[PDB]
């Protein structure tokens, strides 16, 4: 069976700063499993899809926590490698930008950044129908090349390559221009997901507009593009048309990792092989149907200061779609 | 003059909390930490004039440490900041079979980037005591910075205090700390060791405790204090030794008391030649150190008071 969704990249700890409780009581931080591709993997596993997380975890308490969290969720762990050379990355989340949500990362150096091409396993790509990655595994030259090689290997092995930009400027070296790597990753993906802001960023790097960006994507492997709005309406584009994705109102909005997990999960269930993506992209009726499912997953996922605390099961997602209909 | 200059690392201790409810995320409590940093705070709480010299990150944790120093009464103008690295983190959780584990996010770290040019002459000319620990010797650069600070202090007339506080886990894999430890020990006037560290040092010499003590007398050391997990504190000088009839609290009480008793660095020598004073001062140091922690002062209050009365009578 070649139905496994391979999520590659970083898995890290989101440390959620809690509000001050009493007097000089020490502030508390809550430990939550995180990482863009990691969240996608857990969302897929919760729905019942075959999924594996490929990446490097530290040989520390946090790495053990992430490993066990993956196992408990049903995510295959065979492709995970370990290292004592660096610690598991930490992402501290709090408030200080006045009342804004602040971020403090312990990642210029981290375990996930040390994954090398030699760590990939042929069995992973043999059984993979989808390879999903994000730009965080492109923050330095070495890890970026590993991500590109994974995308190239996936394509050659018959897997659909999914790329959710998930651009986080803070994680990139000061003074360096990430444009080059982002465009390269974009040229190697069959399915691309961008936020409105990232689309604007990319347009600026071209000294042009959104249309120019989309046309640039069509010059590569891209067959499907999703653009998320801060608000909530997701737009989709293929080389033959464009439209909107049905949304859901379930009280908390922009499509994130759960949405992606929902989408890839459906792809793996419905596609016999990678070539099936082409027919899918030529059929707006299927596109709308599948993205509605993805939106339902995103709407049901529960987050706390970012970081997912609960992913929905298939029955719950289908019930929402059935009800809100 | 009068100020106690504590130099080195200030970091965040993240204490893992026992799981309250299965489905809830494990919690970690933030606490100001760092060896010389904690001593600086204790001295300040006791009422001594103290300044912490070191580098703090420009992050949320650095601001927390800076504020903690300020609130305790520690002088902060000797503190420098950097965005180049994050404030170090020290995770202590009860990992595996009831044993308390550790996970340090150091190196890299902001405190490791303090450079010689960050020292201010004003800090040294006003210092009666310069106190350091081995944590600021974990890499070649910060170690040299620490040694130069100790030399500057000595040259400026400050008593140099060195609390080994050896933590192997913080040192580079495959390296032997012995060399740096001995160099630091050779530059201190006052040395504080745990019984364990004494044995460790003895081994580096392939000898006994006496060999370590004699080696110490080869450098600047005039007073050695050796603490026990469970037992009296042993003191040693170049002419004698004995025990104090009674950890970091102790070091705080000691520095605080030394600063209250000694007019200058030369006063340490007279002190070392006066066992009665050594005994009285260290016992008091241990006792008053408990205050750097409405509360009861008993039985310590009466114990201290009865002794002074008897001595005066």
UniProtKB/TrEMBL annotation, chain A:
Coiled-coil positions: none
Binding-site list for ATP: 168, 193, 228-229, 256
Limits of the Carbohydrate kinase PfkB domain: 3-312
Alphabetical keyword list: ATP-binding, Kinase, Nucleotide-binding, Transferase
GO molecular function per UniProt: ATP binding; kinase activity
PANTHER family noted in UniProt: HEXOKINASE FAMILY MEMBER (PTHR43085), PSEUDOURIDINE KINASE-RELATED (PTHR43085:SF1)
Protein name: Fructokinase
């Amino acid at each position: 069976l070649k139905k496994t969704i391979l999520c590659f990249g970083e898995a890290l700890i989101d440390m959620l700063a809690q509000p001050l409780v009493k007097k000089g009581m020490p502030r508390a931080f809550l430990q939550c499993a995180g990482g863009a591709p990691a969240n996608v993997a857990v969302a897929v596993a919760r729905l019942g899809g075959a999924v594996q997380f490929v990446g490097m975890l530290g040989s520390d308490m946090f790495g053990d926590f992430l490993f066990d969290s993956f196992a408990e969720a049903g995510v295959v762990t065979d492709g995970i490698v370990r290292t004592s050379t660096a610690k598991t990355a930490l992402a501290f989340v709090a408030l200080d930008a006045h009342g804004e949500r602040s971020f403090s990362f312990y990642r210029p150096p981290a375990a996930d950044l040390l994954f090398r091409v030699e760590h990939f396993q042929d069995a992973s790509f043999s059984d993979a129908l989808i390879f999903h990655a994000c730009s965080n595994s492109m923050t330095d030259a070495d890890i970026a090349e590993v991500t590109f090689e994974g995308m190239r290997r996936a394509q050659a092995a018959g897997a659909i390559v999914s790329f959710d930009l998930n651009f986080r400027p803070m994680l990139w070296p000061n003074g360096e221009n990430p444009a080059s790597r982002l465009w390269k990753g974009l040229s190697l993906a069959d399915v691309v997901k961008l936020s409105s802001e990232e689309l604007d960023y990319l347009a600026n790097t071209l000294a042009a507009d959104a249309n120019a960006v989309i046309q640039q994507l069509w010059q590569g492997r891209a067959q499907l593009l999703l653009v998320t709005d801060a608000a909530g309406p997701v737009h989709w584009y293929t080389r033959t048309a464009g439209g909107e994705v049905p949304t859901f109102r379930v009280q908390v909005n922009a499509a994130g990792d759960a949405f992606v997990g929902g989408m890839l999960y459906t792809f793996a269930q419905q596609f016999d092989d990678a070539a099936a993506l082409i027919d899918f992209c030529h059929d707006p009726e299927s596109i709308v149907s599948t993205l509605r499912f993805a939106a339902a997953v995103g709407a049901l996922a529960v987050t706390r200061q970012g970081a997912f605390t609960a992913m929905p099961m298939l029955s719950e997602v289908l019930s929402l779609i059935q009800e809100q209909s």
